[PDB]
Amino acid sequence: TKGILGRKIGMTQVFGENGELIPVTVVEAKENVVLQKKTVEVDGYNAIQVGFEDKKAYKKDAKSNKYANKPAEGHAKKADAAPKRFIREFRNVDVDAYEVGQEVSVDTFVAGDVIDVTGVSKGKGFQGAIKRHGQSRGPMSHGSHFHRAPGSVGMASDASRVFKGQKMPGRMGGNTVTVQNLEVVQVDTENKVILVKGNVPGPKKGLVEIRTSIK
């Protein structure tokens, strides 16, 4: 029903009614603007696109994503908006209620909703078999030479091959993760911040896509 693009600032704690330490993740949602209203007969599925943050305007000889390029200026000027930095869309919302060009405000959420925050994880880089996959590693003594490597990767002559999905070393992080059934403790309308009980995925200064639980 509701959706807002925000970014993660950090974590703190709130002493709620009945003195309970509620661990919280503060999220800064500001100038969320609808840029389109997808429709079933025009695009095949009804949804709305929200742009977050604020890039600078086009300049000739730009060398960074700080400034908008001509292609993006046009997309945002059709919604009379400023070029934005992060653009996502929401399907769960009902399109008739919204309108192209409106601001999505932190106050969309009331205290005590149930939301799903979808971000991207923090990068751990190239990581071994046991940190990436939770594997028990071998003996550290008693004359062992098998400390952290993964064990057998297969059988023998039957399946003279390694099967797909064998949990081997690679790059951890950089995965979209959706924590479910979190809730908001307070919405602040002036500093533009939605506080969410628990913890959310991602580095500090990241991007979170808060919407209403699908369960």
Binding site: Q13, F15, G19, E20, L21
Partner: protein, 122 residues
């Protein structure tokens, strides 16, 4: 964090001066326990006399572990020694002159005779 092969002091005049644990009841694969959790244990030092004697297998409930426990407000209670109290399979102690403090979390586990026969609930 109390696991098997952990030696605990007894906090009763039941007859056992110090005991060690074998299992932590409560689930397949359960490995650890804290205040308010029951275990199986065999005494290793008994008083001359007492109802419980050396080498017996007994139920018991943890009180005042040194890892301690978080409370819902962000308050933590820690202690300087592990300790335990023997039970009679009805959440009831054996001695009646329990020594040392006891946490307030034993109230919930309905170990009320343990909380009533205690120097300090905390």
């Amino acid at each position: 964090m109390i696991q098997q092969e952990t030696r605990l002091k007894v906090a009763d005049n039941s007859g056992a001066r110090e005991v060690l644990t074998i299992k932590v009841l409560g689930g397949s694969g359960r490995k650890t326990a804290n205040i308010g959790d029951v275990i199986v244990c065999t005494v290793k030092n008994a008083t001359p006399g007492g109802v419980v004697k050396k080498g017996d297998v007994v139920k018991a409930v943890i009180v005042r572990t040194k890892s301690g426990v978080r409370r819902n407000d962000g308050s933590y209670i820690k202690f300087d020694e592990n300790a335990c109290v023997i039970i009679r399979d009805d959440k009831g102690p054996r001695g009646t002159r329990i020594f040392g403090p006891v946490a307030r979390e034993l109230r919930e586990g309905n170990f009320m005779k343990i909380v009533s026969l205690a120097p300090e609930v905390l």
